[PDB]
Amino acid sequence: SIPTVERSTRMSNPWKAFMEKYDIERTHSSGVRVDLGEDAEVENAKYRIPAGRCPVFGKGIVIENSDVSFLRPVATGDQKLKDGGFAFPNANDHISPMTLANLKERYKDNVEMMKLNDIALCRTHAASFVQNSNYRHPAVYDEKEKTCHMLYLSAQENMGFCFKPDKDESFENLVYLSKNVRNDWDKKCPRKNLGNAKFGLWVDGNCEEIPYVKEVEAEDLRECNRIVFGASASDQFKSKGRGFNWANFDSVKKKCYIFNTKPTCLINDKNFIATTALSHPQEVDLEFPCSIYKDEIEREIKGERIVLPRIFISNDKESIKCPCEPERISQSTCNFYVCNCVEKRAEIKENNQVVIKEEFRDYY
């Protein structure tokens, strides 16, 4: 009979589906700055080759003391060595470079290949050239010129020839593509930076600051994005995508904060933009998913026994059923309120690990 309201003991995270694409270790799973994640036996010899499953936006190779773009064919037969780039040679063109039109005509009678997005079409094309080898060439797609370049050299860094991977304005429309990039990278992989947001850690019902980050000066989002790229998982020893892959850029204080633990939520903060090593150097989506908490609270609700979820933030402050006044979050563009005065069952300990508090370990 008696109608009741209580707080759930289930420890959830409403950000799980949204945040999967930012779990770089799981979704990309190889180096980002330098990706040599797979091994290949080219008949009797031994090679390392890019294996990452996500595209890397804006990445190119910088040839030290040179004016040749790495997108130029490799130096062919005779002719001065590295008077050229990294790309596939001459042949009779026919293979590389190839415009989107050219790729569309080549594969017009392929049903499945015709369904691919442009980046995925370029990727599929490059990875089709060898015969029982997993040695396949990486590609660079130029989104500006709508051109696919197969790369002949798969190495990315030779320093201390001489070259290194970087992100700069000249590479901004380039997408660097291992042979393993997901055809559905638009759903599974980072691209746009997230404005009005910073990365955080979900701690029993609210998204909290990551305590251990490295702070660096950065004038703008592009610089923050370049710095996190320089710091990110490097196979130059297989990283398996583990590294300083993520950064929060404070656009008011002009600081970049890089960290190496996957984020599990976002904090809504109007001063911040959240970026990764894989992400485009400039594109920003400003639309925070404001309804994320309210949707979860309302879904759990819809005499009665109401069990409220462990969600202590929302744009509907009464919905939380906070025992004190919820705090209005000044930096929120969603007008979030937070109930600080509730029992917490998890905490952040060193190395940014979220653990159940000692008091609560038995059960859980």
Q: Which residue has the tokens 């393993």?
A: 180
Neighbours of 283 (CB within 10 A): 14
For the chain, domains (ranges, CATH) are: 1-12+290-364 (no CATH), 13-22+192-289 (3.50.4.10), 23-191 (no CATH)
Nearest residue to 151 (alpha-carbon basis) of 133, 138, 135, 134: 138
Dihedral angle at the C-alpha atoms of 20, 22, 27, 30, nearest 10 degrees?
-160
**Per-residue tokens: 347:** 């905490």
204 and 346 Cβ atoms separated by less than 8 Å: yes
Resolution in A: 2.0
DSSP result, 331-344: T-SS--EE--SS--
- Facing residues of 267 across strands? 198
Residues 6 or more apart in contact with residue 231 via CB below 8 angstroms: 33, 214, 243, 244, 258, 277
Token readout for 247 is 């950064």
**β partners of residue 313:** 338
**Alpha-carbon distances of 128 from 86, 131, 139, 305, rounded to whole Å:** 18, 10, 11, 59
Angle, CA 90 vertex, CA 60 and CA 77 arms, to 5°: 95
Per the structure block, which two tokens stand in for 192?
């746009």
